[PDB]
Design a protein around this ligand. Sequence first.
Ligand SMILES: CC(=O)c1nc(NC(=O)[C@H]2CNCCN2)sc1-c1ccc(N2CCCC2=O)cc1
Length: 130
Amino acid sequence: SMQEEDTFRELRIFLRNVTHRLAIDKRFRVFTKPVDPDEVPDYVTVIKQPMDLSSVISKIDLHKYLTVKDYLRDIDLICSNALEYNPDRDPGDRLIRHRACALRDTAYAIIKEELDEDFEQLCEEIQESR
Ligand SMILES: CC(=O)c1nc(NC(=O)[C@H]2CNCCN2)sc1-c1ccc(N2CCCC2=O)cc1
């Protein structure tokens, strides 16, 4: 309906704002662009479902997220991918893992603080009706 499309538009505006705040944070620069499979040949060996903050922005604008849970699944994928590709004790790995966990924690904290629970419930009930 028209009222439902307004609901999803508000969700998109919210998700764009959250993702922008993550993308300008200096700690998360390593997650802002896709890994180049040419420059990092072993990445596809480990990671079959790549995700990054620029791809999240593209999916918002293609109307792929109907709930905050769909969005958080891709944030969690950015994080879990980084943990899998950086599993070793060396400091480069440990630095990326720390940033990956910080990215996840920061996204969840913004949403917990700023997304109304009833708005998210509405989004979910519209989604379940389709
Ligand atoms: C995404 C991620 O998790 C990631 N992890 C890394 N870890 C390491 O290099 C660890 C791995 N263990 C051995 C020691 N070195 S590099 C890296 C990464 C991030 C971004 C790019 N970009 C930016 C755009 C062009 C491009 O290709 C490439 C790679």
